[PDB]
Amino acid sequence: SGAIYVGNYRVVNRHLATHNDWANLVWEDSSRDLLVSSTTAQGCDTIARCDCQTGVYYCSSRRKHYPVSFSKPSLIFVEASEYYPARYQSHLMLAVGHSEPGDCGGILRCQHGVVGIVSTGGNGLVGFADVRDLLWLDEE
Ligand SMILES: COc1ccccc1CC(=O)N1C[C@]2(C(N)=O)CC[C@H]1C2
Ligand SMILES: [Zn+2]
């Protein structure tokens, strides 16, 4: 589990969104595994606006933050999961790192701010849903 709290937005994995998230929906995209809902309180996270390919992510299944090198956002085939069938997920970045299904929502960050959240993994890989192209998260 986990979310990004920027301005009056909450960014979560679409497959972990709550009823309150759907009832206060701003934007969702199943191909990216992302959903954004509105919040009453202002958040403290800042979004990175950069081309970094190195950063640090939080792994709840180890209670640890790990440094990682990650690929550029791309269209990748992801195996079946109970939340989605085997399909192509867009704006996904891969890295070598430990991940388990419940690690979804952990933040990946660089020196500029939040880059994305854990969305996929298995066998020593971890995948992150990028959010750096969502410029509207910085306004309204
Ligand atoms: C955290 O992902 C891990 C980790 C270890 C093993 C397997 C996975 C992958 C996994 O179960 N999923 C990838 C999902 C997707 N984004 O389509 C999101 C949750 C389902 C579907
Ligand atoms: Zn950066």
The alpha carbon of 108 is separated from its chain's Cα centroid by a whole number of angstroms, namely 8
Round to whole Å and give the CA distance between 137 and 60. Answer: 25
The alpha carbon torsion through 45, 46, 52, 57 (nearest 10 deg) reads 0
Cβ < 5 A residues, ion ligand 2:
48, 50, 52, 110, 112
- Give strand ranges (E) for 1-137: 4-13, 25-29, 34-44, 54-59, 64-69, 74-78, 87-96, 107-110, 113-122, 125-130
Ligand located closest to 77 CA: 1
How many C-beta atoms surround the C-beta of residue 79 within 10 A? 10
Round to whole Å and give the CA distance between 74 and 76. Answer: 6
Round to whole Å and give the CA distance between 16 and 12. Answer: 7
- Ligand 1 surroundings by CB, under 6 angstroms: 15, 33, 78, 81, 83-84, 89, 99-101, 103-104, 118-122
Alpha-carbon separation of residue 72 from 31, 34, 49, 112 (angstroms): 17, 17, 14, 16
Q: Which residue, by CA, sits nearest to atom 3 of ligand 1?
A: 121
Round to whole Å and give the CA distance between 54 and 69. Answer: 4
The alpha carbon torsion through 2, 137, 44, 140 (nearest 10 deg) reads -130
